Amino acid sequence: MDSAPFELFFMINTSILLIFIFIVLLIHFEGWRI
Amino acid sequence: MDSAPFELFFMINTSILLIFIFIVLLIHFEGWRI
Amino acid sequence: MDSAPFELFFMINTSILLIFIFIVLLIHFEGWRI
């Protein structure tokens, strides 16, 4: 009945996750299908 | 000889992952692959 | 002056991420670059 601490964890994570997830996807399509 | 606690870990993990993996992928293709 | 608990966090996190990131790249090269 409390998502105070869990929120931050999911927040900070989303950053590093989105960064790698997006970064990888970008390159993969930026010309990584040699 | 007990995978009670280990099960949940693998459950919540695969879930959160599959969510972002699919969700992020959907958007990236829905018009976010700039 | 203690990175005991912080280490695991960075470990489990990097792991799950590296897994999805690598896994994707693997397949793409395993025969998904049609």
Curated annotation (Swiss-Prot), chains A, B, C:
UniProt disease link: Immunodeficiency 83, susceptibility to viral infections: An immunologic disorder characterized by increased susceptibility to severe viral infections, including herpes simplex virus (HSV), varicella zoster virus (VZV), influenza A virus (IAV), hantavirus, and possibly respiratory syncytial virus (RSV). IMD83 clinical manifestations include acute infection-induced encephalitis and pneumonitis.
Family: Belongs to the Toll-like receptor family.
Protein name: Toll-like receptor 3
PTM field: Heavily N-glycosylated, except on that part of the surface of the ectodomain that is involved in ligand binding. TLR3 signaling requires a proteolytic cleavage mediated by cathepsins CTSB and CTSH, the cleavage occurs between amino acids 252 and 346. The cleaved form of TLR3 is the predominant form found in endosomes.
Domain remarks in the Swiss-Prot or TrEMBL record: ds-RNA binding is mediated by LRR 1 to 3, and LRR 17 to 18.
Tissue specificity annotation: Expressed at high level in placenta and pancreas. Also detected in CD11c+ immature dendritic cells. Only expressed in dendritic cells and not in other leukocytes, including monocyte precursors. TLR3 is the TLR that is expressed most strongly in the brain, especially in astrocytes, glia, and neurons.
Subunit relationships: Monomer and homodimer; dimerization is triggered by ligand-binding, the signaling unit is composed of one ds-RNA of around 40 bp and two TLR3 molecules, and lateral clustering of signaling units along the length of the ds-RNA ligand is required for TLR3 signal transduction. Interacts (via transmembrane domain) with UNC93B1; the interaction is required for transport from the ER to the endosomes. Interacts with SRC; upon binding of double-stranded RNA. Interacts with TICAM1 (via the TIR domain) in response to poly(I:C) and this interaction is enhanced in the presence of WDFY1.
Residue intervals passing through the bilayer: 9-29
Upper lineage: Eukaryota, Metazoa, Chordata, Craniata, Vertebrata
Gene from which the chain derives: TLR3
Source domain of life: Eukaryota
Cell location: Endoplasmic reticulum membrane; Endosome membrane; Early endosome
Job of this protein: Key component of innate and adaptive immunity. TLRs (Toll-like receptors) control host immune response against pathogens through recognition of molecular patterns specific to microorganisms. TLR3 is a nucleotide-sensing TLR which is activated by double-stranded RNA, a sign of viral infection. Acts via the adapter TRIF/TICAM1, leading to NF-kappa-B activation, IRF3 nuclear translocation, cytokine secretion and the inflammatory response.
